[PDB]
Amino acid sequence: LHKEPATLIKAIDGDTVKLMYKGQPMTFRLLLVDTPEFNEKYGPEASAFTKKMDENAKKIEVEFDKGQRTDKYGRGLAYIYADGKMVEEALVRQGLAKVAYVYKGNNTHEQLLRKAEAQAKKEKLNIWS
Ligand SMILES: Cc1cn([C@H]2C[C@H](OP(=O)(O)O)[C@@H](COP(=O)(O)O)O2)c(=O)[nH]c1=O
Numbered sequence: 001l002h003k004e005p006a007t008l009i010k011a012i013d014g015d016t017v018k019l020m021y022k023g024q025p026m027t028f029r030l031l032l033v034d035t036p037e038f039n040e041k042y043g044p045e046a047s048a049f050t051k052k053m054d055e056n057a058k059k060i061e062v063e064f065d066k067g068q069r070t071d072k073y074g075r076g077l078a079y080i081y082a083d084g085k086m087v088e089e090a091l092v093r094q095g096l097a098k099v100a101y102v103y104k105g106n107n108t109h110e111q112l113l114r115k116a117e118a119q120a121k122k123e124k125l126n127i128w129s
């Protein structure tokens with residue numbers, strides 16, 4: 001897998017972001033995680049976390065996995081990186097997302113994320129508190 005450029009267009013919520021990719025505006029859904037909806041507990045915190053991470057970043061990159069690149073809703077499915085840091089991993093390490101939606105063709109970074117979840121679980125962070 002390889003990272004490709006994109007630019008922030010706008011924050012949406014904890015696990016969705018509007019990015020420009022290959023010149024075209026697109027909503028991206030972060031692979032392999034589930035943040036709470038904005039109206040759910042830790043939802044606002046998740047949205048804030050991802051907004052800031054993405055806003056502050058000098059450089060956003062997308063990384064498609066091996067499978068499906070767009071979901072049923074037209075959202076691109078990728079891992080997102082902000083200055084080389086995976087947003088999934090950051091969210092999951094803070095207990096602001098669960099590992100989730102792990103489908104067979106598109107699960108390259110499962111265990112990395114699971115490892116992060118375990119440490120958030122142990123620290124009883126946020127979702128785990
Ligand atoms: C993360 C991800 C979600 N989805 C779809 C499954 C879910 O369908 P349903 O809408 O039918 O529940 C929905 C969850 O996304 P959200 O958590 O953004 O709502 O998005 C995929 O199809 N592939 C994926 O890799």
Ligand SMILES: [Ca+2]
Pocket residue numbers: 015034035036037
């Ligand atoms: Ca969600």
